[PDB]
Design an enzyme around this catalytic site. Structure first.
Site, short mmCIF file in Angstrom:
data_model
loop_
_atom_site.label_atom_id
_atom_site.label_comp_id
_atom_site.label_asym_id
_atom_site.label_seq_id
_atom_site.Cartn_x
_atom_site.Cartn_y
_atom_site.Cartn_z
N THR G 1 0.85 -1.22 0.00
CA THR G 1 0.00 0.00 0.00
C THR G 1 0.87 1.25 0.00
O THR G 1 1.75 1.40 0.85
CB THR G 1 -0.94 0.04 1.22
OG1 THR G 1 -1.84 -1.08 1.18
CG2 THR G 1 -1.74 1.35 1.27
N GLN G 2 0.62 2.14 -0.96
CA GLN G 2 1.31 3.43 -1.02
C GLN G 2 0.29 4.54 -1.27
O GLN G 2 -0.92 4.33 -1.16
CB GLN G 2 2.37 3.45 -2.14
CG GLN G 2 2.84 2.10 -2.66
CD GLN G 2 1.95 1.58 -3.78
OE1 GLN G 2 0.73 1.56 -3.64
NE2 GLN G 2 2.56 1.15 -4.88
N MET G 107 -1.50 -6.61 -2.14
CA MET G 107 -1.69 -5.33 -1.44
C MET G 107 -0.55 -4.34 -1.69
O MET G 107 -0.17 -3.57 -0.80
CB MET G 107 -1.91 -5.56 0.07
CG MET G 107 -3.16 -6.36 0.40
SD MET G 107 -4.68 -5.51 -0.06
CE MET G 107 -4.74 -4.21 1.16
#
Ligand SMILES: [Mg+2]
Lengths: 235, 204, 240, 231, 212, 222, 233, 195, 244
Positions: G1-2, G107
């Site tokens: 996740t970013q 993810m």
């Protein structure tokens, strides 16, 4: 010394060829396939009279529709049977159905060549896998430690195999009944066995569509032996 | 919730003339509930004494651990471990659990068998050594103990005078802490004799 | 890791390491198992080359796997401890998961499976041990006696012997043991077990160990004097 | 002699005997023929039985809708290599929505067999494969050797007595290549080719095994009374 | 959901409702909450439908492998413990299961084990699980006897689901009945609650509050 | 924070006949208040006379269908080109779905075909693999608008025979393929009127012993 | 996740009778800062495919390298690399779609919306979409971000369904695309005047147009607009 | 589960444990035995989180039974309690700790003395004349502090235990459905079937 | 490959013997003799250092007798370095047991553990066995005073009096001749030293060639004391018994 997975100059795997010699020393097992069912029979060959012969388990159930007979180093078969049973049950879990006899046999034979330097050597036991499915009907397979399996109408493995196979060559036809097959296994077993055949040193079994796989009682087998003696004395 | 104040209890250690003293209360509790009045917090490995306050399961675990380690030490070294060496062992052992520590407040006390020098030391839960000349305090009434020790203490006390000082420091500190008390023990330690005294105190 | 295939087939179809493991069993002290009508008796030989021994603490030849099953052996002593340990762990594991103690057949099948595994695993040699496993299934009064060997094969026996000079004591048992009417009482079964060992043992002093197992976890080991009384009665009848 | 104990050892003349012994297992295996035109590619295989009670060992394996092979030698090794091909064909379809080129399929089999010849402990594959397929560049026929050598051909044969069929195809080269839009005639040429490798025994109904792939023909295997037409 | 099972003289009665909901939305009225593990063993589904279906079907596979290896019918104790040990490994992961593992063997007799996704495993005589469990318990507790006939016991299980189906908003649709004997379970039909309610109301005289 | 799930809308409907089965679905694909495509096929022929749709999050839907089609292919390889029966396919899909129990395929799956006796079959799955054979099942956005209508018009629920007044139920007479298609079309026409995510086009796959046939119908594009 | 940092806005596209058109502006924004004005967001693959990318630019550059690497890999042991076994638009898309869905499933997504425009071997138009969730769809017109809301409505007036594609010429299609780019410049606060346009035609091949500008803008009416209600001066 | 009590008298240890099993809104069982025999002269009662309690108790039981077979010898109550403590102390820093509190009542055949050990889920061990877990001590300890004597008979211990249970039944909001009482002495373990 | 150079340390001979175990036992037969004698009121451990030098620092030296814990000690015969690897493992096992059960490890359990480790090296791993034979002298409250021995095979047995190392045949006969069950520690001390004095390959038995130890309940009240004898103390007991 030398590799376990080594090829001979003739193009054969030494260890596989040597395991086949161990199977030749094993007790006789015979299978006969008919349109009414497949019959499996074995020589128990107790090493002493004090050994309780009913504890000798050389015929085994894999599933309700698949049976199995063994010959050779019978201790090696236990993991093969375990795998087969797991494979049969696992397929039923994934697909809500019976597993094909060929597919089961193929799953067992995949273990065969998983040896090297996985297990340290090939299996020292041959299996006669008999069963029934809806697609190909009654079937009899011969699973070797080479990883190869042949389907057979009739097959004998063990010490009296080549003599029994020659006898099966003449006797088998496509219109055999189940009762005829039962007596035929008993006839050929009696021929190749060292000791005199009776209900305690030999065992019968069969697989039918209706009743599934069944190992025969010693009382049931005894009657078939008595029926055999009379019909041979009849001419 | 706070692991260092679930069970409660205190330890104090002091130096005197050719002697050290270490003392502790006897309470073990589950927060407000008093569970045991016989939970001793001072242990010894040979002539080296170790007090441990904080989470009781860790107190027990670390005692068993240092018994383990000092026993192997003795077999290999062919001699009993000294207070200075043991202090470093306690520090090393606590810091190896840097990011998952034992919730304890250890206190080392003893006399070096070769030099005869009195020695005390304290640690935080993570292994930082506090090597004070005068006194070391630990537990849920450490503030109270700091106050008692700072005023009552004077250097070079004789064994039987030091007993009175450390006993009064412990008792009056514990009486101002809900999670300390229920009895007390005081060790007076000399180079080749150790006297253990149970104190009479209020049981509330 | 060490992955060398020690147990392998030879041109004549033999696995010599498994066969040489049997030779280690042949060297081991004699062990015998005899099942009566309501009991099983495990007889064991103690070689008298070792005196000044402490018989209190010396490892006994018969070992309890559970309260209702026992295991004796012939062959390498150190090897036997590994099989005994594994069996004892499996017995408790079975009770824990199935909520019922192991059957004698199940425990035999497990030990035999371990022995087999060591005949086709890399970097290991087979156990130089054959075992006699005896007892009674839970809530069952039928006696059970099984035998295992290095190859991993196992089977049930009315009576059986293993170890040195086991050929002789098997000869004795084959003519003296009647299947239609086995030893009806504990006395008769123990007597026949002692008699069979007396064909091989030498002296009937501290060289014979006897353990009697009865239904419902009733296992007891006979003492020197109790066994000596059997030895006395056997030879007095023989003088005729 | 002293240099055939394992696959990792060159001989003094630069030979790999274990690979050559694996090659020998193919010669012991039953004959199988491969040939193609510009529209279709055909596999013909003589199946071998253990005895009269036994079945005839299957020789042909399907890898995808547009590709498959025939085997000669150790059948389990063919099952491993064919399974690997099935996965590579399937990877290409799933990831790239692209049917795997027959030439690229050969490159993958070569590299897989090669790793087994250079490393200690393992062994070479003991089987030869004839891969047919129809891709974006038309019909194809490959010959796989467990040494690693894969060869694209108009026609070929491997197994016992395979030289007879191979010579026939070498003569018929100019004829059978031109059999376009006629599957039955291309199979006939294959059945006539494999017949040159027969001695004593002849092509019966449960003996013969034929497979075909082409322009508007998915890879399909013919056994039993389906091949009685060509006997 | 409402599921029950109780031990009695003639074996075990198992009774369940048939409703499945996603919030207020009634997803199905024809859901099977009795898993036929094998011809001798039954399991009820409450909590997570997939979790119960999957793992009790899996349980059947384990029971089959047991009796192949041991040449003997698996005990209800052993069967239930295979499931409880399995879900206990997953504890914390979020499995949702509340089931009764029901069976009738020689050594045990009729046996019921309540098994839980928290790892709970309880042997008992009467169990009720689901959003309408409290309603079913009332009818059971007041009318239960060990010496019930198979006919009356079947009706008691049916009537108890009906009690829950009426009051509990997340229970209803239809009632599935099973009778577990030593020789195996016997299915006793699907009973629509709509038709059953009026039938029971008239014949029994109950539910006077409701206008029919 | 990254949200791995999304809602692509759409509505699907499976109905099992006596000797046939239909699986229908609208062709509209959406995110929020925007239309991605007016024609994006959602119901798929998977071979072996089985049709499938995985409605909800289209990426998981496409992944599952792709994996199931793959399972059919490998079933043929491993088991001598045996036909995968609808019941076997259903159990296989359960394991595919439950395989991701703790990171689910965010879809409501329906398959349709014929059972081994030749009768019409529909199977319905929840996101994590609980499944059941059903006669009638709508899935997706407008499922709550369609199912009550089907209860009434297919199963004749709450319908009684005139004159008897609640005493005799309307008999459950068998519906023809032409009769089912009418109910499917009217279900989607009604759903299109009252649900914003439903529209553009309706694609129906009909399964019989003869094979799989397709029918397409226009829907309102607003 | 970013979270995305340097971003690219709308990519728009449509099918016409003989092929496809795709366009995207040359801006790399840094939040509200219009940081980089010379960013090419249309990346051609061979002579038959153009991949248009919006969203995170660092991920775009990563994807750009994957496609460059794909061409190299395809040429290995491939005599027909520039003929029958050349990369198709469908191959390129399916590859990206696989990657995007795999990355979302770990993810750790590639924070992009991608449109693959091209022409297949048989002359068929290829136009399909894929994004950070691995969601895919095809349509006669496709657009990302703001383009979906403003460009699609305009492009759908030209090609409203499949049957309108053969009736639409390259001149009409290009005109619609260019107008849509002007509308986006009026109304998207993260857009620039400069853009690139690519045409992939089955007859004339790939035509790549750089340094285009939005022109013929209407602003004169702004002089008359005064205040926010009551103000006259 | 809820209430578990323990009292060490002159020649025996008495453990009392509640019978109720409540899973949410309903009482599913009113006859649950919250105890396991570890060895012939060692009994362990337990209370804590569902599943973990029985899983832990049976795991300990199996391990002690294994030790008994291997050595042909019964471990002392002290030895068993130390083993149990270590398992719980190991558990508290695990990925998912056992949420289980136990009382270990045993009769040491070597010393001819009854012994009661109290261990919580953290691995906090204490040897006591009487003990409890959870809220049970809050109601009962004042009575035990008052009446307890180290030379009490088993019959007197049971009477003091009845008084403790009566106080629990009066002032506790929860209905724990009475208690199962077991006595551990030189002759082994037995259950008081009427209480 | 590597197979060529493998000695195969864990295989049976045709006769059913473990080659490496048998050869390790041959190695141990050339090691200095160690004797253990168990009495009613204690245990004696006596052992002979191998051909020493006059420049060897004896008072700080330890090659034969080692302490495992306060209750259990061992006499070594074989490769000293191998023995120390096993000794440290045994010391750790004793402490693990003490930490777990809060009770000192019973002698047999410790002996079984070490013997099982030795066994493992003979059955798997492809490594050479430990060329070591131990005599375990120890005490616990179950069996009291106990003597054990283990050898490279991993087999262990209990004894009243036993020898390991060199001349065990001669030593065991002498012990079997003069040992009695009602014997005491002071008598056992004399027997041990007399046995070594006769079996030794050296010309005369002196203090510098010996290591000596006693495990006595001769400690103040119910407890056990280990006494590792100092060079001067060995010299005194040699004069007391009348050997020098
Ligand atoms: Mg207070």
């Amino acid at each position: 010394d030398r590799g376990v997975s080594t090829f001979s100059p003739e193009g054969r795997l030494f260890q596989v060829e040597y395991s086949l010699e161990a199977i030749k020393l094993g007790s006789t097992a015979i299978g006969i396939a008919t349109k009414e069912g497949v019959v499996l029979g074995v020589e128990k060959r107790a090493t002493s009279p004090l050994l309780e012969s009913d504890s000798i388990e050389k015929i085994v159930e894999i599933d309700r529709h698949i049976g199995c007979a063994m010959s050779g180093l019978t201790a090696d078969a236990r993991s093969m049977i375990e795998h087969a049973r797991t494979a049969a049950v696992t397929h039923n879990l994934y697909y809500d159905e019976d597993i094909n006899v060929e597919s089961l046999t193929q799953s067992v034979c995949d273990l065969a060549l998983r040896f090297g330097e996985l297990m340290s050597r090939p299996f020292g036991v041959a299996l006669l896998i008999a069963g029934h499915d809806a697609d190909d009907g009654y079937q009899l397979f011969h699973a070797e430690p080479s990883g190869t399996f042949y389907r057979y109408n009739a097959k004998a493995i063990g010490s009296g195999s080549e003599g029994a196979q020659a006898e099966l060559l003449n006797e088998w036809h496509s219109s055999l009944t189940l009762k005829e097959a039962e007596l035929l296994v008993l006839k050929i077993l009696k021929q190749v066995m060292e000791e005199k055949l009776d209900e305690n040193n030999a065992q019968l079994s069969c697989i039918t569509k209706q009743d599934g796989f069944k190992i025969y009682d010693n009382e049931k087998t005894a009657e078939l032996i008595k029926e055999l003696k009379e019909k041979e004395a009849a001419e | 919730s706070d692991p260092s104040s679930i069970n409660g209890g205190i330890v104090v250690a002091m130096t005197g003339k050719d002697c050290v003293a270490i003392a502790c209360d006897l309470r073990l509790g589950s927060q407000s509930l008093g569970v045991s009045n016989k939970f001793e917090k001072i242990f010894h490995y040979g002539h080296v004494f170790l007090g441990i306050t904080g989470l009781a399961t860790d107190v027990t675990t670390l005692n068993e651990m240092f018994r383990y380690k000092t026993n192997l030490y003795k077999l290999k070294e062919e001699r009993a471990i000294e207070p200075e060496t043991f202090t470093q062992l306690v520090s090393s052992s606590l810091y190896e659990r840097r990011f998952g520590p034992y919730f304890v407040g250890p206190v080392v006390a003893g006399i070096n068998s070769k030099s005869g020098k009195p020695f005390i030391a304290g640690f935080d839960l993570i292994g930082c050594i506090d090597e004070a000349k005068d006194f070391i305090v630990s537990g849920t009434a450490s503030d109270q103990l700091f106050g008692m020790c700072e005023s009552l203490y004077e250097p070079n006390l004789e064994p039987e005078d030091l007993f009175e000082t450390i006993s009064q420091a412990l008792l009056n500190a514990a009486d101002r802490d809900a999670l300390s008390g229920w009895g007390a023990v005081v060790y007076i330690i000399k180079k080749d004799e150790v006297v253990k005294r149970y104190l009479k105190m209020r049981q509330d | 890791g060490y992955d060398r295939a020690l147990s392998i087939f030879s041109p004549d179809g033999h696995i010599f390491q498994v066969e040489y493991a049997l030779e280690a069993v042949k060297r081991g002290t004699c062990a015998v198992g005899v099942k009566g009508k309501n009991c099983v008796v495990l007889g064991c030989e103690r070689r008298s080359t070792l005196k000044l021994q402490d018989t209190r603490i010396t490892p006994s030849k018969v070992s309890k796997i559970d309260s209702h099953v026992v295991l004796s052996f012939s062959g390498l002593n150190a090897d036997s401890r590994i099989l005994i340990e594994k069996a004892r762990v499996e017995a408790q594991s079975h009770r824990l998961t199935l909520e019922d103690p192991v059957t004698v057949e199940y425990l035999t099948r497990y030990v035999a499976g371990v022995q087999q595994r060591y005949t086709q695993s890399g970097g290991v040699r087979p156990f130089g041990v054959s075992t006699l496993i005896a007892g009674f299934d839970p809530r069952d009064d039928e006696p059970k006696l099984y035998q295992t060997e290095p190859s991993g094969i196992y089977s049930s026996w009315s009576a059986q012997t293993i170890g040195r000079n086991s050929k002789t004591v098997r000869e004795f048992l084959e003519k003296n043991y009647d299947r239609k009417e086995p030893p009806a009482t504990v006395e008769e079964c123990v007597k026949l077990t002692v008699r069979s060992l007396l064909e091989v043992v030498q002296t009937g002093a501290k060289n014979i160990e006897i353990t009697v197992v009865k239904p419902d976890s009733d296992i007891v080991a006979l003492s020197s004097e109790e066994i000596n009384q059997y030895v006395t009665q056997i030879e007095q009848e023989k003088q005729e | 002699n002293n240099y055939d104990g394992d696959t990792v050892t060159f001989s003094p003349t630069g030979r790999l005997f274990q690979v050559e012994y694996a090659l020998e297992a193919i010669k012991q295996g039953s004959v199988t023929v491969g040939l193609r035109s510009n529209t279709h590619a055909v596999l013909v295989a003589l199946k071998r039985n253990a005895d009269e009670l036994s079945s005839y060992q299957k020789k042909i394996i399907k890898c995808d809708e547009h590709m498959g092979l025939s085997l000669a030698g150790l059948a389990p090794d063919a099952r491993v290599l064919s399974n690997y091909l099935r996965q590579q064909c399937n990877y290409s379809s799933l990831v790239f929505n692209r049917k795997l080129a027959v030439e690229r399929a050969g490159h993958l089999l070569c590299d897989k067999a090669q790793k087994n010849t250079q490393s200690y402990g393992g062994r070479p594959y003991g089987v030869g494969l004839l891969i047919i397929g129809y891709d974006k560049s038309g019909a194809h026929l490959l010959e796989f050797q467990p040494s690693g050598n894969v060869t694209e051909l108009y026609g070929t044969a491997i197994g016992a007595r395979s030289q007879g069929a191979k010579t026939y195809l070498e003569r018929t080269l100019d004829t059978f290549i031109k059999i376009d839009g006629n599957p039955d005639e291309l199979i006939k040429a294959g059945v006539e080719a494999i017949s040159q490798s027969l001695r004593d025994e002849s092509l019966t109904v449960d003996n013969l095994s034929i497979a075909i792939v082409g322009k508007d023909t998915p890879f399909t295997i013919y056994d039993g009374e389906a091949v009685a037409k060509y006997i | 959901t409402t599921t029950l099972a109780f031990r009695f003289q003639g074996g075990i009665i198992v009774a369940v409702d048939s409703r499945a909901t996603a919030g207020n939305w009634v997803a199905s009225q024809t859901v099977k909450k009795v898993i036929e593990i094998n011809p001798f063993l039954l399991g009820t589904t409450a909590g997570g439908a997939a979790d119960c279906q999957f793992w009790e079907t899996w349980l059947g596979s384990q029971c089959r492998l047991h009796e192949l290896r041991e040449k003997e019918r698996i005990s209800v104790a052993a069967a239930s413990k295979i499931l409880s040990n399995l879900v206990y490994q997953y504890k914390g992961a979020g499995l949702s299961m509340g089931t009764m593992i029901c069976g009738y063997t020689r050594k045990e007799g009729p046996t019921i084990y309540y098994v839980d996704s928290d790892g709970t495993r309880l042997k008992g005589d009467i169990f009720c699980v689901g959003s309408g469990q409290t309603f079913a318990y009332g009818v059971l507790d007041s009318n239960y006897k060990w010496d019930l006939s198979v006919e009356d016991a079947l009706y008691l299980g049916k009537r108890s689901i009906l009690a829950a189906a009426h009051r509990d908003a997340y229970s209803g649709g239809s009632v599935n009945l099973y009778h577990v004997t030593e020789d195996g379970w016997i299915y006793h039909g699907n009973h629509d609650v709509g038709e059953l309610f009026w039938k029971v109301k008239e014949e029994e005289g109950s539910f006077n509050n409701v206008i029919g | 924070q990254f949200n791995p799930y999304g809602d692509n809308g759409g509505t699907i409907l499976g109905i099992a006949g006596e000797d046939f089965a239909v699986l229908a679905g609208d062709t509209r694909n959406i995110t929020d208040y925007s239309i991605n495509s007016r024609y994006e096929p959602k119901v798929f022929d998977c071979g072996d006379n089985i049709v499938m749709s995985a409605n909800g999050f289209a990426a998981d839907g496409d992944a599952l269908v792709k994996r199931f089609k793959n399972s059919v292919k490998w079933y043929h390889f491993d088991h001598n080109d045996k036909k995968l029966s609808i019941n076997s396919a259903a159990r296989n899909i359960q394991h595919l779905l439950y395989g991701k129990r703790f990171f689910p395929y965010y879809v409501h799956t329906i398959i349709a075909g014929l059972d081994e006796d030749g009768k019409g079959a529909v199977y319905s799955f929840d996101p994590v693999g609980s499944y059941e054979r059903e006669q009638c099942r709508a899935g997706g956005a407008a499922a709550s608008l369609i199912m009550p209508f089907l209860d009434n018009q297919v199963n004749f629920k709450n319908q009684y025979e005139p004159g008897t007044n609640g005493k005799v139920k309307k008999p459950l007479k068998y519906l023809s393929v032409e009769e089912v298609i009418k109910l499917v079309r009217d279900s989607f026409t009604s759903a299109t009127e009252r649900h914003i995510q439903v529209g553009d086009g309706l694609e129906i796959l009909i399964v019989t012993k003869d094979g799989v046939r397709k029918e397409f119908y226009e829907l309102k594009r607003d | 996740t970013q979270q995305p940092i340097v971003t690219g806005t709308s990519v728009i596209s449509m099918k016409y009778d003989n092929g496809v058109i795709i366009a995207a502006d040359n801006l790399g924004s840094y939040g509200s800062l219009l940081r980089f004005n010379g960013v090419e967001r249309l990346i051609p693959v061979g002579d038959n495919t153009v991949v248009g990318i919006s969203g995170d630019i660092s991920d775009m550059q990563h994807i750009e390298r994957l496609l460059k690497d794909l061409v190299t890999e395809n040429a290995y042991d491939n005599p027909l690399a520039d003929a029958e076994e050349a990369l198709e638009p469908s191959y390129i898309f399916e590859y990206l779609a696989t990657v995007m869905y795999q990355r979302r499933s770990k993810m750790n997504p590639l924070w992009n919306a991608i449109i693959v425009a091209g022409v297949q071997s048989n002359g068929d138009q290829f136009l399909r979409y894929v994004n950070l969730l691995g969601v895919t769809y095809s349509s006669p017109t496709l657009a990302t971000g703001f383009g979906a809301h403003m460009a699609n409505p305009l492009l759908r007036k030209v090609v409203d369904r499949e049957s309108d594609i053969p009736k639409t010429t390259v001149q009409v299609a290009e005109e619609a695309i260019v107008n849509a780019m002007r509308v986006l410049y009026y109304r998207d606060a993260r857009s620039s005047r400069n853009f690139s346009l690519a045409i992939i035609d089955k007859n004339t091949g790939l035509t790549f147009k750089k340094n285009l500008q939005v022109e013929n803008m209407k602003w004169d009416f702004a002089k008359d607009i005064k205040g926010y209600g009551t103000q006259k001066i | 589960m809820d209430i578990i009590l323990g009292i060490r008298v002159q020649d025996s240890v008495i453990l009392a444990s509640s019978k109720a099993v409540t899973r949410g809104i309903s009482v599913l069982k009113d006859s649950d035995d919250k105890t396991r025999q570890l060895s012939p002269h060692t009994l362990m009662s337990f209370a804590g989180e569902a599943g973990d309690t029985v899983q832990f108790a049976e795991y300990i039981q199996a391990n002690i039974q294994l030790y008994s077979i291997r050595e042909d010898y019964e471990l002392s109550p002290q030895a068993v309690s130390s083993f149990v403590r270590q398992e719980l102390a190991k558990s508290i820093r695990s990925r998912r700790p056992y949420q289980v509190n136990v009382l270990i009542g045993g009769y040491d055949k070597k010393k001819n003395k009854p012994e009661l050990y109290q261990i919580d889920y953290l691995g906090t061990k204490v040897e006591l004349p009487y003990g409890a877990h959870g809220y049970s001590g809050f109601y009962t300890f004042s009575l035990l502090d008052h009446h307890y004597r180290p030379d009490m008979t088993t019959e007197e211990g049971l009477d003091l235990l009845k008084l403790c249970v009566q106080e629990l039944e009066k002032r506790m909001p929860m209905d724990f459905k009475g208690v199962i009482v077991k006595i551990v002495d030189k002759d082994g373990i037995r259950q008081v079937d009427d209480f | 490959g590597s197979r060529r150079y493998d000695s195969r340390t864990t295989i049976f001979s045709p006769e059913g013997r473990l080659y490496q175990v048998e050869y390790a036992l041959e190695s141990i037969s050339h090691a200095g003799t160690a004797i253990g004698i168990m009495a009613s009121d204690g245990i004696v451990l006596a052992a002979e250092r191998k051909v020493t030098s006059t420049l060897l620092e004896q008072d700080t030296s330890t090659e034969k007798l080692y302490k495992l814990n306060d209750k259990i000690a061992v006499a070594v015969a074989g490769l000293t370095a191998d023995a120390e690897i096993l000794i440290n493992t045994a010391r750790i096992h004793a402490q693990n047991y003490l930490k777990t059960y809060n009770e000192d490890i019973p002698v047999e359990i410790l002996v079984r553990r070490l013997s099982d480790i030795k066994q493992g090296y003979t059955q798997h791993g492809g490594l050479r066995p430990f060329g070591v034979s131990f005599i375990y002298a120890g005490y616990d409250d179950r069996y009291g005073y106990q003597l054990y021995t283990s050898n490279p095979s991993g087999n262990y047995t209990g004894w009243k009096a036993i020898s390991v190392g060199a001349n065990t045949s001669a030593a065991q006969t002498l012990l079997q001749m003069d040992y009695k069950d009602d014997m005491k520690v002071d008598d056992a001390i004399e027997l041990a030293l007399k046995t070594l004095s006769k079996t030794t390959d050296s010309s005369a038995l002196t203090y510098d060639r010996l290591e000596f130890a006693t495990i006595r309940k001769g400690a103040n009240d119910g407890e056990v004391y280990q006494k590792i004898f100092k060079p001067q103390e060995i010299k005194d007991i040699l004069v007391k018994t009348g050997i020098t």
